[PDB]
mmCIF file of C-alpha atoms and ligand atoms in Angstrom:
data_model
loop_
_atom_site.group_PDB
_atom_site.id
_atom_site.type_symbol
_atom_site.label_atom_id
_atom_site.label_comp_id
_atom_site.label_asym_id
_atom_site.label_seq_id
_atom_site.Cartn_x
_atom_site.Cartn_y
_atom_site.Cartn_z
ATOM 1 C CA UNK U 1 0.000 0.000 0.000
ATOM 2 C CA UNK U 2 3.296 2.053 -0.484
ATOM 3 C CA UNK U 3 3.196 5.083 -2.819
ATOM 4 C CA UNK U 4 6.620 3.954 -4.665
ATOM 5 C CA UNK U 5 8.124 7.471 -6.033
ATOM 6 C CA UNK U 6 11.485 7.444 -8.065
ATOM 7 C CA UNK U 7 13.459 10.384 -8.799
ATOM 8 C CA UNK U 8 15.188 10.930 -12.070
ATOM 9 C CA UNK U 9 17.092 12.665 -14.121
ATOM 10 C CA UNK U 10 20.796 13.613 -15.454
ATOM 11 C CA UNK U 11 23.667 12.865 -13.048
ATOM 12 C CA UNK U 12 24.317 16.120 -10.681
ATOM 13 C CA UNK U 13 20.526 17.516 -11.386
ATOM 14 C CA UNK U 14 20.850 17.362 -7.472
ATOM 15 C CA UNK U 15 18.469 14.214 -6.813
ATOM 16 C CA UNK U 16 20.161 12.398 -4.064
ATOM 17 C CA UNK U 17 20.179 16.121 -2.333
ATOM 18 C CA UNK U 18 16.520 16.732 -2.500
ATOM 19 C CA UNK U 19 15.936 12.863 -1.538
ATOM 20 C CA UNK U 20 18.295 13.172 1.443
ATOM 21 C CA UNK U 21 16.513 16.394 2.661
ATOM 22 C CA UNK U 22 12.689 14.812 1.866
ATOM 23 C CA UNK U 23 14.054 11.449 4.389
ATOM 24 C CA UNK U 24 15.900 13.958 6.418
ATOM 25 C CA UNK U 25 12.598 16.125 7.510
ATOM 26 C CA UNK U 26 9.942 13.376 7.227
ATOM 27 C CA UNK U 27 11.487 10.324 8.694
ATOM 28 C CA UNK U 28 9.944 8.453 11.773
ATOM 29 C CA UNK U 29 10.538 5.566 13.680
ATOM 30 C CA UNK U 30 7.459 2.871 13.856
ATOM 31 C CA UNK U 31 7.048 -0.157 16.230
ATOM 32 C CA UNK U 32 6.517 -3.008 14.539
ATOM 33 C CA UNK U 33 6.794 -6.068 16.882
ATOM 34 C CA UNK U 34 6.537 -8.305 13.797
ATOM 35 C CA UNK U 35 9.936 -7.584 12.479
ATOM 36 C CA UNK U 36 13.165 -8.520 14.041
ATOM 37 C CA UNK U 37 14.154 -5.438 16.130
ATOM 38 C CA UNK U 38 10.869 -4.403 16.247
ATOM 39 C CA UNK U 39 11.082 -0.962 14.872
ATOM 40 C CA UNK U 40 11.895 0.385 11.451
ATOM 41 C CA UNK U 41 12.322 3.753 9.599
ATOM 42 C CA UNK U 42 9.476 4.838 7.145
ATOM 43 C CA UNK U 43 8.971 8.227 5.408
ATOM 44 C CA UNK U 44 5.356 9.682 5.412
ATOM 45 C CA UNK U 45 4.909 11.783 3.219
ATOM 46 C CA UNK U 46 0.570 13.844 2.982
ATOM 47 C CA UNK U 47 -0.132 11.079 5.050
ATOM 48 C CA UNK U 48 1.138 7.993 3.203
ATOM 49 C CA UNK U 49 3.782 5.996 3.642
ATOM 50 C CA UNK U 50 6.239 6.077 0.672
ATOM 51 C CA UNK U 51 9.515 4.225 -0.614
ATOM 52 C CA UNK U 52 12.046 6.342 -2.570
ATOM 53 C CA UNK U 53 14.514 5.047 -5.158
ATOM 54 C CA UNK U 54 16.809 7.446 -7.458
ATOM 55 C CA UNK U 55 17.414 6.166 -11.212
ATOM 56 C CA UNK U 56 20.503 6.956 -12.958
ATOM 57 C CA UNK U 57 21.887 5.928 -15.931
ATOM 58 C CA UNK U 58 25.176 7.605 -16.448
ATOM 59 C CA UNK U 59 28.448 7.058 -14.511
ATOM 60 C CA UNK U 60 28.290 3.753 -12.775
ATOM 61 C CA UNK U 61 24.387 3.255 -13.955
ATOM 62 C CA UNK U 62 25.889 3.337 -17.165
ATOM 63 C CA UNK U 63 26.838 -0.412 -16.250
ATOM 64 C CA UNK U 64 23.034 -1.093 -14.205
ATOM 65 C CA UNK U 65 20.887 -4.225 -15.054
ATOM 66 C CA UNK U 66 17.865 -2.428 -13.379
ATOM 67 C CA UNK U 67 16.193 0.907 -15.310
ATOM 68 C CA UNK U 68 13.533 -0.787 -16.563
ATOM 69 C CA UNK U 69 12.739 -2.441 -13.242
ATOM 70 C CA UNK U 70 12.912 0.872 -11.472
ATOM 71 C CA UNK U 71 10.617 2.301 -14.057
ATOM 72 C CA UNK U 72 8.056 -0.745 -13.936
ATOM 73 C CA UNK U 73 8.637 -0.488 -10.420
ATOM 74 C CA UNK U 74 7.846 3.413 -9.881
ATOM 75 C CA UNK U 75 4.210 4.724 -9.216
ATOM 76 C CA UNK U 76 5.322 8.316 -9.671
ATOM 77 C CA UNK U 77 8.462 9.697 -10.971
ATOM 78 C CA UNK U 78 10.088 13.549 -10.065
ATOM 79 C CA UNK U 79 11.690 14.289 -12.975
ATOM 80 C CA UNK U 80 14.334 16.713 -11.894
ATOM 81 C CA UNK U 81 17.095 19.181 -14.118
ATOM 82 C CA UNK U 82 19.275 21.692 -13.094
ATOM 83 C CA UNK U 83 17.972 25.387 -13.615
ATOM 84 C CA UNK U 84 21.639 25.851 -14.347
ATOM 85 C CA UNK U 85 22.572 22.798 -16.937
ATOM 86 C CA UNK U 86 20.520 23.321 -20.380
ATOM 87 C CA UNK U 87 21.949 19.542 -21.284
ATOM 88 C CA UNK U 88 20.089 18.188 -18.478
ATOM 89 C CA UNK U 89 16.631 19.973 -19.340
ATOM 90 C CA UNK U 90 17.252 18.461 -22.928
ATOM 91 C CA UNK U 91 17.415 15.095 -21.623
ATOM 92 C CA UNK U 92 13.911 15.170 -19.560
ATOM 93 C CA UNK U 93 12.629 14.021 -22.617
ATOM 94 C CA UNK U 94 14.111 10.819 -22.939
ATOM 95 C CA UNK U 95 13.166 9.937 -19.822
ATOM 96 C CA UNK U 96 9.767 10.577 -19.915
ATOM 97 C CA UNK U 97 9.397 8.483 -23.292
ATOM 98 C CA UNK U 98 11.351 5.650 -21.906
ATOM 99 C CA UNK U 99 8.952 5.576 -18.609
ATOM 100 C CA UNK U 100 5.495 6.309 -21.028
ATOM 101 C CA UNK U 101 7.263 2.858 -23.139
ATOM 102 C CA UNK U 102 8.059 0.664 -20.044
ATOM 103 C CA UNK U 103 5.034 1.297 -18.261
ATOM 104 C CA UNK U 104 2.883 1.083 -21.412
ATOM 105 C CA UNK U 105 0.885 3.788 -20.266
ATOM 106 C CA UNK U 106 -0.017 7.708 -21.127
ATOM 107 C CA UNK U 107 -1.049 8.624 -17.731
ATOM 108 C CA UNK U 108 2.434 7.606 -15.667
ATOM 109 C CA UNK U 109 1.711 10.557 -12.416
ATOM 110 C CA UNK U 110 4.742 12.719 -12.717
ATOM 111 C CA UNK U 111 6.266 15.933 -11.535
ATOM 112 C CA UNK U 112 8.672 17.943 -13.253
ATOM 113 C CA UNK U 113 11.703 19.579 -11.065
ATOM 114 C CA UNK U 114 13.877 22.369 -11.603
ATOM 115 C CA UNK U 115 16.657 22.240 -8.965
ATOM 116 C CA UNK U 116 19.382 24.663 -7.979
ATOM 117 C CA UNK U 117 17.122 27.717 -8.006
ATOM 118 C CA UNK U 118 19.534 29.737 -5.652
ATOM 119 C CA UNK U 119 22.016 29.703 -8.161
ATOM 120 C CA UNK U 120 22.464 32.888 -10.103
ATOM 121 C CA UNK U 121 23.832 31.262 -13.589
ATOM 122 C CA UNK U 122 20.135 30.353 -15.170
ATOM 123 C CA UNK U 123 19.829 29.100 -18.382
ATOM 124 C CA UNK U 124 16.804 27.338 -18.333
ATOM 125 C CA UNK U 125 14.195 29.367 -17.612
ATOM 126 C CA UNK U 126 11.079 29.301 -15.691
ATOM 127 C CA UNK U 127 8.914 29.568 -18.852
ATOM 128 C CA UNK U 128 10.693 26.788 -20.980
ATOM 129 C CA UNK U 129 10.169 24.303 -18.100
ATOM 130 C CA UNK U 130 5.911 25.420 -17.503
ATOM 131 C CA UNK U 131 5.590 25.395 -21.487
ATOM 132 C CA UNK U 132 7.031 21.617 -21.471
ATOM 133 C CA UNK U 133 5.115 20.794 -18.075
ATOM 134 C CA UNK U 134 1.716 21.358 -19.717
ATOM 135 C CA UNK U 135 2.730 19.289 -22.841
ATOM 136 C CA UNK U 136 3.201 16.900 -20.502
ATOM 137 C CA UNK U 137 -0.018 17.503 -18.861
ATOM 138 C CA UNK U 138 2.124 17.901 -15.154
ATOM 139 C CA UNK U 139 2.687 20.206 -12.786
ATOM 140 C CA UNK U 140 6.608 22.232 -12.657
ATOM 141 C CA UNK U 141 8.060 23.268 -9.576
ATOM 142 C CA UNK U 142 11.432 24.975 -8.758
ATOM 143 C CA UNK U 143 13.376 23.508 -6.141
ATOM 144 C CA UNK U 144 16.768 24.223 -4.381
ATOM 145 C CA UNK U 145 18.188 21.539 -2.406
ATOM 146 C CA UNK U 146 19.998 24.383 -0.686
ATOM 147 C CA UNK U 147 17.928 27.057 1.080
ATOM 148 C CA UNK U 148 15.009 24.026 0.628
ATOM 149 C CA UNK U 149 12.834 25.915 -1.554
ATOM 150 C CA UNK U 150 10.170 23.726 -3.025
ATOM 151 C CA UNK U 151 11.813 20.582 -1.978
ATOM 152 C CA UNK U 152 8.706 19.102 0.341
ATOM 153 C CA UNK U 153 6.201 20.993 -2.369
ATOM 154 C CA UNK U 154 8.032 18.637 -5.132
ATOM 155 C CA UNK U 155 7.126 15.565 -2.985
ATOM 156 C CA UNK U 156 3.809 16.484 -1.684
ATOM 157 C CA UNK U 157 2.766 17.425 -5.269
ATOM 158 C CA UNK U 158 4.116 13.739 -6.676
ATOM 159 C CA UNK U 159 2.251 12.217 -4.017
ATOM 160 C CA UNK U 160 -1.496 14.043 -4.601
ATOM 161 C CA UNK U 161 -0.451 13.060 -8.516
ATOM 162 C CA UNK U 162 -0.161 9.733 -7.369
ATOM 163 C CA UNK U 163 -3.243 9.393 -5.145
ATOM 164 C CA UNK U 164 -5.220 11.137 -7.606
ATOM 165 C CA UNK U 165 -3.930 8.550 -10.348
ATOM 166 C CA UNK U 166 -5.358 5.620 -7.799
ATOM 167 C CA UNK U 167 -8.516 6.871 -7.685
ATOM 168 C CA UNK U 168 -9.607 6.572 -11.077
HETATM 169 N N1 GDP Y 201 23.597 25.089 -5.295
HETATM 170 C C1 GDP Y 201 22.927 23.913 -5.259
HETATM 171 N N2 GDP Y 201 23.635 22.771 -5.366
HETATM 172 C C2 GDP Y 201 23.006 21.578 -5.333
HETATM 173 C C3 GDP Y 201 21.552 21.514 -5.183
HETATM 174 N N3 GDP Y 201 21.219 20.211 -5.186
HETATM 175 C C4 GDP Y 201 22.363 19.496 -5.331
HETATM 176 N N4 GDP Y 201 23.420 20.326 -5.402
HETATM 177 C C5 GDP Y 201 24.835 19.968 -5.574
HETATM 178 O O1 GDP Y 201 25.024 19.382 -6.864
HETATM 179 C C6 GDP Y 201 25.998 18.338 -6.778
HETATM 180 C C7 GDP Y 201 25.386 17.041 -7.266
HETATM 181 O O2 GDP Y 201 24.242 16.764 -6.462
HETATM 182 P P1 GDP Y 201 23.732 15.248 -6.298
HETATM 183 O O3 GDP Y 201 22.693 15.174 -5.207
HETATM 184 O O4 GDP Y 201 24.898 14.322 -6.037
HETATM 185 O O5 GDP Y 201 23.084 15.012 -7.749
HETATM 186 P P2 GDP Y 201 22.598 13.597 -8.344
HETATM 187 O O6 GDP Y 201 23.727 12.969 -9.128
HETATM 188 O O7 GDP Y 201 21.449 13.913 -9.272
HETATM 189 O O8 GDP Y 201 22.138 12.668 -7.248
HETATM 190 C C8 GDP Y 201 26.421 18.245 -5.318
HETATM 191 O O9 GDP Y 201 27.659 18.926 -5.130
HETATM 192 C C9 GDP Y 201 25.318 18.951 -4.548
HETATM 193 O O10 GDP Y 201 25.782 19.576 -3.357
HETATM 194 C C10 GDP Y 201 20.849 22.807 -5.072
HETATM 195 O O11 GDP Y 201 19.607 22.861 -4.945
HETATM 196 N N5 GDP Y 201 21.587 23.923 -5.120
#
């Protein structure tokens, strides 16, 4: 009964950061007298209980086994760029078609992320993310790891897309 959300997107877009912070502030411990210790870490995130994976595929996911599985896997997917690395907004593309193909599906809930919005060196801007986001059909948020702008709206958002998705 999990919501399973992935993050993805080009290698130093920041996801491991904004993943880090979203365990970091929503993180509790739960008893559970079933399981060996009898207590184990969850992350709730709008009231659900949610498991968190990161895909790459560059650097040492370049050699990985497992991006279909993660995409199969994945109810929701935060598809993250840099506000400062035009490559990696080029590449959101690719990884939205690949997820659409795995999952043989047009609705796949999603959320598109542009991280590092403290830094001053923009190149993608604000407008060129939106206009994509509602090709997409999805909602855009800006993010900054950093100073934690937008980070728990990214996840809440994801989540509600999720939910909403379940419903139907
Ligand atoms: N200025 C700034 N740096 C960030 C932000 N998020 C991540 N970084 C930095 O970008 C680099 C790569 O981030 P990382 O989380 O490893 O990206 P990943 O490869 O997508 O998981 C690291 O040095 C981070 O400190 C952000 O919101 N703002």
């Amino acid at each position: 009964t999990e919501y399973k959300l992935v993050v993805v997107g080009a290698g130093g877009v920041g996801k491991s950061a904004l993943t880090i912070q979203l365990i970091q502030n929503h993180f509790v411990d739960e008893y559970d007298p079933t399981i060996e210790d009898s207590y184990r870490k969850q992350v709730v995130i709008d009231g659900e209980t949610c498991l968190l994976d990161i895909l790459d595929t560059a650097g040492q996911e370049e050699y990985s086994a497992m991006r279909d599985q993660y995409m199969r896997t994945g109810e929701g997917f935060l598809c993250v760029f840099a506000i400062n690395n035009t490559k990696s907004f080029e590449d959101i593309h690719h990884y939205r078609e690949q997820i659409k193909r795995v999952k043989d599906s047009e609705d796949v809930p999603m959320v598109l992320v542009g991280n590092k919005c403290d830094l001053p060196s923009r190149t993608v801007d604000t407008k060129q993310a939106q206009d994509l986001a509602r090709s997409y059909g999805i909602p855009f948020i800006e993010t900054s790891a950093k100073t934690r702008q937008g980070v728990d709206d990214a996840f809440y958002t994801l989540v509600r897309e999720i939910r909403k998705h379940k419903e139907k």
